[PDB]
């Protein structure tokens, strides 16, 4: 059954709830983004339409075969008519394709859910600005003052830097970089970049990254691993293991491994500062974890919330324990009070 959380209200409406079976008077199913624990349901099968963006229409079609008649893509800032309702989709600044979606209800009420998202200052000069919104789904994942990481562009700089240093030091020097689902793609393309590379990979991924409209791609990747110095690998294998099981295969092109893990938040965050960070070593092969987010750091989404000053919140993270509920519902009231709505 699906749960509240994922219903909007005076509509035939239901919000990345596709593994519930039919859900009862929904006329229309919204998905915010290619994330499995959002999309999880959808398949070749499904006949009911799904409303979403050209990216993640893209994705549905090509990686689980959802045929087209079913699949509703929609321009982004743009007002449209959904059975009779007004929506908006609004860039999510998480993953490609991701979005945050607006719902202007028939008795004048004002919805917004954000899927998921990486608050930003710029989400203040949307199409937000010009209206009241009543109710706000949150993404809530990082809703504890202890979550603080770097800016993106931060992060990246520290990338770039690390493997040009390395690889200058030694040609023979190869970089991989982790992945398992779509987001965090400039990672592998800044570092591929400056080294004057493409990024190699497997075809099921060259196939992910052909569906998400980034410019001059065929440019920046391809499935011929020999002739590239940047790999990608799935992040289960990115340890002393299986990085040294890759290494073999190269063929004696290349003696040292330097990887990269893109994490969300971990603890030494608590502590260390990016220009900081050290890897794990073991022989001829180094492994950094760096906390690429594609989540609101606490700060982040406490000045977005204050801006947006919501009636209602309704978290979407995060909402299986009394603990992490009472938790959150204490800043929700802080916020409010310290900023006067
Ligand atoms: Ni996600």
Redesign the pocket.
Same mark, same amino acid.
């Given at each position: 059954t699906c749960p509240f959380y994922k219903k909007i209200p005076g509509t035939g409406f239901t919000v990345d709830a596709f593994q519930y079976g039919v859900v009862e008077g929904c006329t229309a199913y919204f998905l915010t #983004?290619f #994330?499995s624990? #959002?999309y999880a349901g959808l398949s070749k099968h499904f006949t009911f339409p799904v409303y979403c963006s050209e990216i993640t229409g893209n994705l549905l079609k090509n990686k689980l075969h959802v045929q087209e008649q079913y699949i509703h893509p929609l321009p982004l800032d743009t007002e449209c008519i959904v059975n009779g309702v007004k929506v908006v989709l609004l860039d999510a600044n #998480?993953?490609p394709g991701?979005v945050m979606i607006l719902f202007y209800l028939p008795n004048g009420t004002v919805i917004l859910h954000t899927g998921?998202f990486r608050a930003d200052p710029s989400m203040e000069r949307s199409l937000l600005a010009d209206q009241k919104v009543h109710m706000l789904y949150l993404d809530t994942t990082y809703c504890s003052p202890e979550y603080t990481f770097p800016s993106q562009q931060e992060v990246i700089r520290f990338a770039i830097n690390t493997a040009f240093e390395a690889v200058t030091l030694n040609p023979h020097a190869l970089v991989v970089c982790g992945t398992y689902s779509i987001?965090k793609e400039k990672v592998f393309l800044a570092i591929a970049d400056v080294l004057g590379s493409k990024v190699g990979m497997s075809q099921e991924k060259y196939k992910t990254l052909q569906c998400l409209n980034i410019p001059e791609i065929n440019s920046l990747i391809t499935t011929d691993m020999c002739s590239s110095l940047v790999h990608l690998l799935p992040m289960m294998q990115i340890n002393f293991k299986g990085l040294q099981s890759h290494l073999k295969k190269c063929g004696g092109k290349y003696n040292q491994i330097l990887a990269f893990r893109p994490t969300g938040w971990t603890h030494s965050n608590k502590f260390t500062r990016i220009a900081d960070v050290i890897p794990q070593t073991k022989g001829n092969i180094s492994i950094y974890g760096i906390p690429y987010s594609?989540h609101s750091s606490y700060l982040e989404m406490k000045r977005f919330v204050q801006w947006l000053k919501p009636q209602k919140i309704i978290p979407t993270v995060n909402v299986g324990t009394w603990k992490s509920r009472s938790t959150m519902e204490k800043y929700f009231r802080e916020w409010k009070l310290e900023a006067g709505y």
């Open positions: #983004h #994330h624990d #959002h #998480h993953c991701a998921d987001g594609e």
